[PDB]
Amino acid sequence: MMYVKLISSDGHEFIVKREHALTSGTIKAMLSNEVNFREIPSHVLSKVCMYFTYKVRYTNSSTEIPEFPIAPEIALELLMAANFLDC
Amino acid sequence: VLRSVNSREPSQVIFCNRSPRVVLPVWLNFDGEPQPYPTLPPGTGRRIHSYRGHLWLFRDAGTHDGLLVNQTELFVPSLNVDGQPIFANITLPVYTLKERCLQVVRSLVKPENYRRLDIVRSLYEDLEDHPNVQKDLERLT
Amino acid sequence: MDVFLMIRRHKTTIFTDAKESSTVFELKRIVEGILKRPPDEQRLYKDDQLLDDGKTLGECGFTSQTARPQAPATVGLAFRADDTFEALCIEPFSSPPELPDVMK
Ligand SMILES: CC(=O)N[C@@H](C)C(=S)N1C[C@H](O)C[C@H]1C(=S)NCc1ccc(-c2scnc2C)cc1
């Protein structure tokens, strides 16, 4: 399975499966193996990568789906990222 | 268009809330109007009397966020095989990250203060356009 | 049963999964493919505890109900340059801002 690199504004390099990252239409356009995010800090982009894993695990699944958690401290910045990424 | 059929053929049902939300059952009556029923706490269930061909959908009772029932939008009671009740498993959907983010922001900020938040004007309109049963009924049409 | 992990060294973070029944050594083989460094130049840690190559992830505390997709468990990583291993170093993420007045 091919992996891709997503880099935050503060320099954290996140490495995730290509398939997982293709959840975002925006990221698919930026690729079609590294992508730099000048506006997304590592504490937003780490949560974004967790959402990918969650989304692939529980999509088309009959087993009980749990709540995706979001702390109040990151909601605003994360809303703006999800809107840009379209996921 | 979306309305219960008047069959008068009884059907026992178990509403089972397998979500972390407080659930509001909604029966679509014979004129297509949504009727609200008493709420179900998280992890609880109730045995109820409905009829065959009657339409039901389910929401979060506080925020009207959409929930699924047996994997889908609507529930219609079917014929009871060997007098056994039909199970209606209410669950969370896999929300989009955007809609999940809007749920959390709506729960922290009061409606009046949405326009004071430092975001694009399209995100004010996404926040203010809060989930609604009558909108989704037009959407399923 | 699958467990979901963040493997972290310096400013690098790998998101991946594995079985509870799989070994520490087998996880190093996953790192070898991504980061291009063989198992014998790697050290894996649960907090400040070095992990043995032969032990299963379940024995080292990575269970399917604690290491979840929406909240994965962290595994420290440290490379060997030439002769000796480096000290374990995991750079923290950025701090969020203060809650705006309206969200309080
Ligand atoms: C002639 C006819 O069909 N009349 C309708 C108004 C009837 S009797 N209905 C509409 C739906 O098919 C359900 C049924 C009613 S009102 N059943 C009684 C009932 C009462 C409470 C509940 C609920 S829902 C959550 N908690 C409770 C106790 C469920 C069913």
Author numbering:
A (entry chain B): 16 to 47, 58 to 112
B (entry chain C): 62 to 202
C (entry chain A): 1 to 104
The authors write:
Hydroxyproline is the key recognition element of small molecules targeting the von Hippel-Lindau (VHL) E3 ligase, which are of interest as probes of hypoxia signaling and ligands for PROTAC conjugation. Herein we report the synthesis of VHL ligands bearing thioamide substitutions at the central hydroxyproline moiety, and characterize their binding by fluorescence polarization, isothermal titration calorimetry, X-ray crystallography and molecular modeling. The new structures revealed that the noncovalent interaction network between the compounds and VHL residues was fully conserved and consistent with those observed with previous inhibitors.
To obtain the final doubly substituted compound, deprotected intermediate 6 was reacted with thioamide derivative A to give intermediate 9 (49%). Boc deprotection of this intermediate followed by acylation led to the final thioamide derivative 4 (64%). In contrast, ligand 2 (single right-hand side thioamide) showed a greater loss in binding affinity (10-fold loss by FP, and 20-fold loss by ITC). Double substitution in ligand 4 resulted in the weakest binder of this series, with Kd > 10 μM. The presence of the thioamide on the left-hand side of Hyp resulted in Tyr112 bending slightly to accommodate the bulkier group. An increase in hydrogen bond distances was observed for compounds 2 and 4 (3.0 ± 0.1 and 2.95 ± 0.05 Å for O–H⋯SC groups, respectively) compared to 1 and 3 (2.52 ± 0.05 Å for O–H⋯OC groups, on both compounds). We therefore evaluated the interaction energy of each protein amino acid in the complexes with its surrounding to determine differences in relative EMM-GBSA compared to reference inhibitor 1. Conversely, full thioamide replacement in compound 1 to yield compound 4 led to an unexpected 2% decrease on the trans isomer as observed by NMR.
